[PDB]
Amino acid sequence: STALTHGLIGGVPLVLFAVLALIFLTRKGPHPDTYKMSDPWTHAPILWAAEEPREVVIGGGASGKW
Amino acid sequence: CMNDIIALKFHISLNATTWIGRIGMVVLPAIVYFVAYRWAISLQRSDREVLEHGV
Amino acid sequence: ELEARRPFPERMGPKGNLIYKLITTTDHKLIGIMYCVVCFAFFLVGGLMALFMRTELAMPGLQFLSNEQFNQLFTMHGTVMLLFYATPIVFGFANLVLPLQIGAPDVAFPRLNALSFWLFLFGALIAIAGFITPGGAADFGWTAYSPLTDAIHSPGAGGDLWIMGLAVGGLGTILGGVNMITTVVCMRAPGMTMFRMPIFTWNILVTSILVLIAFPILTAALFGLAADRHLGAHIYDPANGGVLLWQHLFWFFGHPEVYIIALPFFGIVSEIFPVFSRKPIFGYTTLIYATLAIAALSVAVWAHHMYATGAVLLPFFSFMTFLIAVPTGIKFFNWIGTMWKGQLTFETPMLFSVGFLITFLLGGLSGVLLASPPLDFHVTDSYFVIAHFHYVLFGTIVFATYAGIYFWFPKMTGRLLDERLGKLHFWLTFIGFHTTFLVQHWLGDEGMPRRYADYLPTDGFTTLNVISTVGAFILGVSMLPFVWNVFKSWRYGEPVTVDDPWGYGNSLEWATSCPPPRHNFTELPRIRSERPAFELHYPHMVERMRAEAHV
Amino acid sequence: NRPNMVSVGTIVWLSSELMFFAGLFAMYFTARAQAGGAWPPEPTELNLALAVPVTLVLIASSFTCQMGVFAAERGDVFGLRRWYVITFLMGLFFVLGQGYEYIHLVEHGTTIPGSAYGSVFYLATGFHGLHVIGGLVAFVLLLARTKMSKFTPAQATAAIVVSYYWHFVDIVWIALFATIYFVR
Amino acid sequence: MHIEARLFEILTAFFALAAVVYAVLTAMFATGGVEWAGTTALVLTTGLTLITGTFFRFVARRLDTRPEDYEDAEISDGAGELGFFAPHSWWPILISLSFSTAAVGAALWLPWLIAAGVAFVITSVCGLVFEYYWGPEKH
Amino acid sequence: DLPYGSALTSSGRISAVTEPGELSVHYPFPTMDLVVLDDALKYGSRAAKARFAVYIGPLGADTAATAREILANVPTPENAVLLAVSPDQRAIEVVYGADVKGRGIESAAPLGVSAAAASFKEGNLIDGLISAVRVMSAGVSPA
Amino acid sequence: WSDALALGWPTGITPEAKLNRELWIGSVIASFAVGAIVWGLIFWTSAFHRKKATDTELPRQFGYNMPLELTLTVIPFLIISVLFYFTVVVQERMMHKDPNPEVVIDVTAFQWNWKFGYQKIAFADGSFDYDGADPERKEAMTSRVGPIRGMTPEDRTYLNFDKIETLGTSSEIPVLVLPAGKRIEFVLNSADVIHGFWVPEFLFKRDVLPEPKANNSDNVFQVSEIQQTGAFVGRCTEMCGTFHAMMNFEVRVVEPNDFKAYIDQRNAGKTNAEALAAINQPPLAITTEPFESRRGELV
Numbered sequence A: 001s002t003a004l005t006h007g008l009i010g011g012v013p014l015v016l017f018a019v020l021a022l023i024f025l026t027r028k029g030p031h032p033d034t035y036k037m038s039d040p041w042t043h044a045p046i047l048w049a050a051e052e053p054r055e056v057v058i059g060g061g062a063s064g065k066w
Numbered sequence B: 001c002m003n004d005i006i007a008l009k010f011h012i013s014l015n016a017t018t019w020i021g022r023i024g025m026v027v028l029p030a031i032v033y034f035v036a037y038r039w040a041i042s043l044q045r046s047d048r049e050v051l052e053h054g055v
Numbered sequence C: 001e002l003e004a005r006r007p008f009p010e011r012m013g014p015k016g017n018l019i020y021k022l023i024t025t026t027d028h029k030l031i032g033i034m035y036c037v038v039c040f041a042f043f044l045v046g047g048l049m050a051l052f053m054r055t056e057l058a059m060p061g062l063q064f065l066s067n068e069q070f071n072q073l074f075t076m077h078g079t080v081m082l083l084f085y086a087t088p089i090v091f092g093f094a095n096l097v098l099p100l101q102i103g104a105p106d107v108a109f110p111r112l113n114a115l116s117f118w119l120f121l122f123g124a125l126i127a128i129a130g131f132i133t134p135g136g137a138a139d140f141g142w143t144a145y146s147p148l149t150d151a152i153h154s155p156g157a158g159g160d161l162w163i164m165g166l167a168v169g170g171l172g173t174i175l176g177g178v179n180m181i182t183t184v185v186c187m188r189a190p191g192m193t194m195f196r197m198p199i200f201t202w203n204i205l206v207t208s209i210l211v212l213i214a215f216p217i218l219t220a221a222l223f224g225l226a227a228d229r230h231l232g233a234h235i236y237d238p239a240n241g242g243v244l245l246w247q248h249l250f251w252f253f254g255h256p257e258v259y260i261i262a263l264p265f266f267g268i269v270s271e272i273f274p275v276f277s278r279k280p281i282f283g284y285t286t287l288i289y290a291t292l293a294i295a296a297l298s299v300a301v302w303a304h305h306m307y308a309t310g311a312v313l314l315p316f317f318s319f320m321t322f323l324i325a326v327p328t329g330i331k332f333f334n335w336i337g338t339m340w341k342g343q344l345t346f347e348t349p350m351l352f353s354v355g356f357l358i359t360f361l362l363g364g365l366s367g368v369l370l371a372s373p374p375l376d377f378h379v380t381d382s383y384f385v386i387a388h389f390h391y392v393l394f395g396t397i398v399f400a401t402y403a404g405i406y407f408w409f410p411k412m413t414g415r416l417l418d419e420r421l422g423k424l425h426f427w428l429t430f431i432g433f434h435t436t437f438l439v440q441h442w443l444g445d446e447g448m449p450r451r452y453a454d455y456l457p458t459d460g461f462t463t464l465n466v467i468s469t470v471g472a473f474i475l476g477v478s479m480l481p482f483v484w485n486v487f488k489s490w491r492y493g494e495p496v497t498v499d500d501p502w503g504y505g506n507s508l509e510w511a512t513s514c515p516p517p518r519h520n521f522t523e524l525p526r527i528r529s530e531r532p533a534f535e536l537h538y539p540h541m542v543e544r545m546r547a548e549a550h551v
Numbered sequence D: 001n002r003p004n005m006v007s008v009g010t011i012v013w014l015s016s017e018l019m020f021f022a023g024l025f026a027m028y029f030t031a032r033a034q035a036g037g038a039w040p041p042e043p044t045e046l047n048l049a050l051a052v053p054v055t056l057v058l059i060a061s062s063f064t065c066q067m068g069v070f071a072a073e074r075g076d077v078f079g080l081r082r083w084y085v086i087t088f089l090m091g092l093f094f095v096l097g098q099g100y101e102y103i104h105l106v107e108h109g110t111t112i113p114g115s116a117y118g119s120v121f122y123l124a125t126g127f128h129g130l131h132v133i134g135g136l137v138a139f140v141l142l143l144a145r146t147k148m149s150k151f152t153p154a155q156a157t158a159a160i161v162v163s164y165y166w167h168f169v170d171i172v173w174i175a176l177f178a179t180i181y182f183v184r
Numbered sequence E: 001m002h003i004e005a006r007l008f009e010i011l012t013a014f015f016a017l018a019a020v021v022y023a024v025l026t027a028m029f030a031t032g033g034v035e036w037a038g039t040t041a042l043v044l045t046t047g048l049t050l051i052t053g054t055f056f057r058f059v060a061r062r063l064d065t066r067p068e069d070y071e072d073a074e075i076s077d078g079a080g081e082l083g084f085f086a087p088h089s090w091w092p093i094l095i096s097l098s099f100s101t102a103a104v105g106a107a108l109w110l111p112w113l114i115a116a117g118v119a120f121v122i123t124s125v126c127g128l129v130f131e132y133y134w135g136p137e138k139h
Numbered sequence F: 001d002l003p004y005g006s007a008l009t010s011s012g013r014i015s016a017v018t019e020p021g022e023l024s025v026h027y028p029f030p031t032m033d034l035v036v037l038d039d040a041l042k043y044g045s046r047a048a049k050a051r052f053a054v055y056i057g058p059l060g061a062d063t064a065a066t067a068r069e070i071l072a073n074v075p076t077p078e079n080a081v082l083l084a085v086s087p088d089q090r091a092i093e094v095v096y097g098a099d100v101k102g103r104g105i106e107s108a109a110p111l112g113v114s115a116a117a118a119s120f121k122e123g124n125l126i127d128g129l130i131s132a133v134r135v136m137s138a139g140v141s142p143a
Numbered sequence G: 001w002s003d004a005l006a007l008g009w010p011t012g013i014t015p016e017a018k019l020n021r022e023l024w025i026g027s028v029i030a031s032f033a034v035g036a037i038v039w040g041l042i043f044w045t046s047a048f049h050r051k052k053a054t055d056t057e058l059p060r061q062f063g064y065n066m067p068l069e070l071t072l073t074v075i076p077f078l079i080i081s082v083l084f085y086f087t088v089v090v091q092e093r094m095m096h097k098d099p100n101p102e103v104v105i106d107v108t109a110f111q112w113n114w115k116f117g118y119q120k121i122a123f124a125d126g127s128f129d130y131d132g133a134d135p136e137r138k139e140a141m142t143s144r145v146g147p148i149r150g151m152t153p154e155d156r157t158y159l160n161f162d163k164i165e166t167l168g169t170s171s172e173i174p175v176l177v178l179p180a181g182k183r184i185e186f187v188l189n190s191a192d193v194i195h196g197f198w199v200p201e202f203l204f205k206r207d208v209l210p211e212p213k214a215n216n217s218d219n220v221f222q223v224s225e226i227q228q229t230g231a232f233v234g235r236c237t238e239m240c241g242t243f244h245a246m247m248n249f250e251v252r253v254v255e256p257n258d259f260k261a262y263i264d265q266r267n268a269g270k271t272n273a274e275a276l277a278a279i280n281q282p283p284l285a286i287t288t289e290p291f292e293s294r295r296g297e298l299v
């Protein structure tokens, strides 16, 4: 017929896309799980610094505890 | 103004040339502004690269 | 030992970081990237043309297209895929890694390299610009058979733009081939002998030789066609013997041209299989001989496209065409032998390479069926032929192209494409391709000729055409995940801080940072075999590879 | 101690350029086999009283071009300029001689639309004449570069590769001249 | 560089054999006699590999072993200046635009556009050739 | 001592590899949260012309003397402001060089301590660092 | 089943088609056997050679097996050599031409339809002889110095004309009537461009060329006989312009006595449609129908 032909052309690719996306995009990626405070800090020490401005006597500091 | 002359020589529909100029009258100036603004700043970066590194 | 790093790498350069580079760059790395984006835009443009035809062929009768528009569609669809997507991306991968593979800082002629890109971009635009003319673009097929292309039978300007656009792009391809031969001969690093280069480098050098034979004769033939159409010449006049004169020259160009877009993608999978199998490429020496034999044989088998003309020496071309299947079969045994007794992990670059093996074989098996004139007498100019070059091109210029893109994306960008999104893309592509192209074998055998805009309800072609139409739209929606992956992973992808994100790379590009510096190398290792990076990263395995090399 | 990169690039491209003339040669031979016994047919009357002196001038231009290479390899920029100017003049004479042949052939009824022989003859010889004109442009561009900077080895390399193209053009004409005016 | 031309001589022999075999096989028991289009293409295809192979044969026997032609060379053997490589140039895009202008004129058969394109190509090619040779302005 | 697949090159650079399908960075934070912190660090440093740094790990027993040593690793430590955080120590050590002295860091550093501590109580490490960097950078002048 | 292994190939109505179909089935069987072996090897290494979780050392680093490599270049050579021999055998039989055909058909292809002419009929049993050559209209095309061997490109003398001709129309599919069990000779000539003469039941096709002699093309092919009566569709296969898909034809096969009756009707001034009705046959084509002249459904 004619309604079935348009239904298969427009329907099957979308149905297949949804089924395959549910199979693959719902899996867990290689990204590490977000760290939680209640868990110990088992990761290696992290030092982050900005690259700006583009390129040792201290001037002071402060303390704090949460 | 030369759309009729361009249409005959370059095989373009006369109706198309009117609408190309009509739509381009609003779209092309926007494209050129964005390109020129990026181009002008990019030449500044090109001038800088010579300054800290030489020719 | 605390070394300061940014929390995340910079997503994009500042304002003005790219626009002046694009028009002034002589860097092969940027130019190679510029070839992938534009060739992937043309691939998208040409794919829309096939979607229009495939939608029209779903039902009998002309629903929205005319005969003229459909005729223009497969001509331009084929021209864009063969000359505007496949041929340039051969040099797209060449500028990405070949100087890295041979330990070179640059190509032989950096400015000539940039000239090829722009000659190719403006030449492709000229041919496509026929669609804005009232008559339309070329409608005589990409083969451009004579005297159908004569001014009497093709008076429109769309055909003339098609001829001149091909000439401009062909000049860029010739110059690119000249650049690649010179670069391999003169820019090799110390200790990198001819028989230590990667298979991809060998394939590109051999392919560039095929360009210099095929493309100049195509340019000569096109200029003769332009003389007929504009000067009233008699080059291709049937009374003068021009019907077969055009076919002979065009197929002397054309069949060497399809190995210009086959051998480099044979090299791409030849680079990927050893990495993910944790084993050295099987028959490294023999693969070079197989490539050379394929290149040599492809020059004297042109007339197997002209079986039905009744004007060619059948035994000569039939036999030599059968000979090509032997070195091609050798490549399968080396690729399987490489995977044999390995440690396969099946990442996305490896997954696409395996799809190549499955897809290319079925198209190859149809090739020997067509190589025999008796069987070709019934299936030529039909959809069985359409099924042959679609199984056998798709594997090389899509499956191996995607495998190379996933393989070398961390190298050229320093970011990893998402694997979950890549697996979805691969399976969508595989299922859609097979669904839309499996039934076309039956259609051509049943009696449906190629290049038909319409058929009749009593012809018995409706059911298989609908199935092919469903699969083609799956290929259309298979395009979205890969585009999304490239768009997202180019700024927010997983950072690459190592030289070899795949662990067991063999060629020299994996012995440098991701991305490589401006001159590609801050140091070079000792070159003693065809896996310098593997030796550099695993010195303890050097003794084992020499001892276990022979079975 | 290393191969000349520009020389390798020029020789590689020169080999590819020969396939362009292969297509033109195929057209001439295909039309010759369909001639039927008259090749060239009437009223085409080729005259060797003009082609032979024109061909000899082009051949002699190769010797003076080679002399400029020897001067270039010797480091004598002035000797290179003198020989390449002489080569340019004889190459220009070849173009004028071919055009003067073209004018008389057209007046006698041999034109591109006139006959199949006219189509192949003018395409084969005309495209070669275009290559000669391109070679004359290369001589002018190279000589203009000689007045811009001191004579360097890279500049001497550019002189050598230009002579490679000129020698290629001269050799192709000998094949064209023998095939058209003798193998009828 | 003995391997590079051995590649071309190997291709040369096969092309010469195919050209000879095809011409002879078309001369006999083939309609119309010798098929000239394929024979001419095959014969001059041998020429392409012959010229490149012969040149590489002459270059190879002049110079001794290069560091990349050694079976056990060290990275330090290649120390030194490699040569001149252009850092940047916008001339190549102008050459292509100049050539595309001529092609469009030839496609639509506009002699004025063809003449403009040829003049543009000559000027664009002149800029590329003279780019790294123009001296300082003299005032 | 080098990791598996890592080699020391002739130029002194380390050529490392990672297993296929694995990551080379693997910070235990979401990718988009890292982008926000990088923007806060990059634009906060630009607005104050002082390099802002963030440290996440231990700080010895007297946190204050560990931060001091840690700040020596930041490029241009004299013009740097380092925020050290020790989840196991549950403390917030902030140190800055002599070039930042007198530019308003004295008023902002306790505020950055207070901002970080408030978000840390809610179980948000990256959010606390982002908040602390923002308030400290806004309180430091390019002088 | 042969139909499943034929992959849509028609059974055939001529002995040449039967021989061609037999070659196709054997080659497909050979191709499938090779493909199954290679696919099995690919699937075997993909399922049993994957990296395990209990392996620490890299696998054996072998990359050269000379005895295996030499063996794997001879076996493919043997298969193609066997296939080439049977390929040469079949094409010699299919291209064989008898000096004494029983029916000679002039096939004239043009843009965009067909014309069928009866050049000569000479039954082997001598019950029907007819000479349909029309040389007083072939000499009227001469056009004549000339650009090509003294002739202008409008010479058209290469075409053949006959007294009884079936001319194709846009609203009438041309039907070619042939006798069953008789040797048929087809002479193909094209007016303008290249067309395609394909009957799927013949399992064979040849391109229709303008000036076939000047292009060294053998435009004549013969079938030994047609083994059954009926109607079979024919299509153009070579891209010939706008209406390349709308110039189909039909071949009607009837009994020798029926064919003789039909030719007499055509000689009596009857058109193709009414002459077919005179022998109790449908006047129009039944396998195909004329395409609607309208350019589409949106017109």
Ligand code: HEA
Pocket (backbone or CB within 6 Å): C043, C044, C045, C046, C047, C048, C050, C051, C053, C054, C074, C075, C077, C078, C079, C081, C082, C086, C141, C142, C143, C386, C393, C394, C397, C398, C436, C450, C451, C452, C472, C475, C476, C477, C479
């Ligand atoms: C070489 C590579 C190549 C590739 C990749 C393809 C890709 C496809 N082609 Fe092929 N094709 C050829 C080479 C190729 N083709 C050649 C050489 C011919 C000869 C034609 C001739 O006779 O002249 C041919 C002709 C041809 C035919 C024969 C038609 C006929 O004769 O009547 C068919 C039949 O369906 C076909 C279909 C397809 C389909 C469905 C795809 C699928 O790849 C398409 C799906 C891909 C897409 C990319 C879809 C696009 C999706 C989008 C979402 C685009 C959106 C973009 C914008 C909005 C800007 N093409």
Ligand code: HEA
Pocket (backbone or CB within 6 Å): C143, C258, C259, C261, C262, C304, C305, C306, C307, C321, C322, C324, C325, C328, C329, C330, C332, C361, C363, C364, C365, C366, C367, C368, C370, C371, C372, C376, C379, C380, C381, C385, C388, C389, C392, C393, C396, G031, G034, G038, G076, G079, G080
């Ligand atoms: C990627 C491009 C590509 C490649 C690689 C090939 C490879 C082959 N092709 Fe071709 N071909 C095309 C692109 C390609 N082709 C295109 C685009 C057309 C139509 C153009 C047009 O009309 O527009 C075409 C058309 C075409 C024709 C003409 C069809 C016709 O129009 O009638 C023929 C006939 O000989 C042919 C045969 C072959 C053969 C034998 C191979 C062989 O190289 C394949 C051999 C491979 C194998 C055999 C598999 C591996 C082997 C083994 C595992 C051992 C098995 C051994 C045996 C079975 C003996 N193809």
Ligand SMILES: CCCCCCCCCCCCCCCC(=O)O[C@H](COC(=O)CCCCCCC[C@@H](C)CCCCCCCCC)COP(=O)(O)O[C@H]1[C@H](O)[C@H](O)[C@@H](O)[C@@H](O)[C@@H]1O
Pocket (backbone or CB within 6 Å): B013, B014, B015, B016, B019, B020, B023, B024, B027, B028, C132
């Ligand atoms: C100066 C550049 C400025 C460009 C800037 C960007 C703006 C571009 C906007 C795009 C314009 C497209 C809209 C035109 C839509 C429109 O109205 O036109 C139609 C016909 O479609 C078309 O043409 C569409 C094709 C348009 C081409 C794309 C534009 C890009 C060009 C401009 C690039 C040029 C190259 C650069 C120049 C170099 C200079 C260097 C800087 C129908 O007309 P008609 O002709 O009546 O057809 C009848 C049927 O309709 C009816 O059914 C029936 O079938 C019949 O009656 C039929 O006749």
Ligand SMILES: CCCCCCCCCCCCCCCC(=O)OC[C@H](C)OC(=O)CCCCCCCC[C@@H](C)CCCCCCCC
Pocket (backbone or CB within 6 Å): B028, B031, C125, C128, C129, C131, C132
């Ligand atoms: C942004 C402008 C885009 C231009 C428009 C093209 C953008 C095209 C994308 C949507 C339209 C195509 C989807 C539907 C087509 C269809 O079924 O029938 C529609 C019409 C009845 O049939 C046509 O024939 C339409 C035009 C054919 C394409 C012109 C090719 C352009 C040549 C290039 C030189 C463009 C340069 C851009 C230059 C960019 C700006 C430079 C300053």
Ligand SMILES: CCCCCCCCCCCCCC(=O)O[C@H](COC(=O)CCCCCCCCCCC)COP(=O)(O)O
Pocket (backbone or CB within 6 Å): D085, D088, D136, D137, D139, D140, D141, D143, D144, D145, D146, D147, D148, E122, E126, E130, E134, E135
């Ligand atoms: C076309 C003129 C032919 C004259 C016959 C003799 C042939 C040799 C001429 C030598 C010219 C030297 C000029 C020179 O050194 O100036 C140089 C600069 O020349 C140029 O930049 C342009 C030269 C002309 C370009 C030609 C383009 C078109 C070619 C047409 C070919 C038919 C000297 O520059 P300078 O200021 O001294 O650094």
Ligand SMILES: CCCCCCCCCCCCC
Pocket (backbone or CB within 6 Å): C431, C434, C435, C438, C439, C463, C467
């Ligand atoms: C991924 C494999 C897809 C296979 C599609 C082919 C289906 C053929 C069905 C034919 C039905 C005829 C009525």
Ligand SMILES: CCCCCCCCCCCCC
Pocket (backbone or CB within 6 Å): C362, C365, C366, C438, C439, C441, C442, G007
């Ligand atoms: C190498 C030839 C492959 C043939 C594949 C055929 C696909 C099956 C189609 C079934 C149609 C049933 C009506």
Ligand SMILES: CCCCCCCCCCCCC
Pocket (backbone or CB within 6 Å): D174, D175, D178, D179, D183
């Ligand atoms: C058809 C009779 C023999 C024709 C032979 C033509 C050969 C032409 C080659 C000339 C090569 C000159 C260098």
Ligand SMILES: CCCCCCCCCCCCC
Pocket (backbone or CB within 6 Å): D025, D175, E023, E027, E034, E039, E040, E043, E044
């Ligand atoms: C029976 C005559 C044989 C002629 C063979 C000629 C081979 C091709 C010649 C090409 C010459 C190109 C310059």
Ligand SMILES: CCCCCCCCCCCCC
Pocket (backbone or CB within 6 Å): G003, G004, G005
């Ligand atoms: C009577 C029709 C039966 C259908 C036969 C289908 C054959 C399918 C073969 C699939 C081969 C895939 C490589």
Ligand SMILES: [Ca+2]
Pocket (backbone or CB within 6 Å): C055, C056, C057, C058, C059, C060, C061, C062, C063
């Ligand atoms: Ca339809």
Ligand SMILES: [Cu+2]
Pocket (backbone or CB within 6 Å): C255, C304, C305
């Ligand atoms: Cu082929």
Ligand SMILES: [Cu+2]
Pocket (backbone or CB within 6 Å): G109, G110, G112, G194, G195, G196, G236, G238, G239, G240, G244, G247
């Ligand atoms: Cu037709």
Ligand SMILES: [Cu+2]
Pocket (backbone or CB within 6 Å): G195, G196, G236, G237, G238, G239, G240, G241, G243, G244, G245
């Ligand atoms: Cu047709």
Ligand SMILES: [Mg+2]
Pocket (backbone or CB within 6 Å): C305, C308, C380, C381, G238
């Ligand atoms: Mg065909």
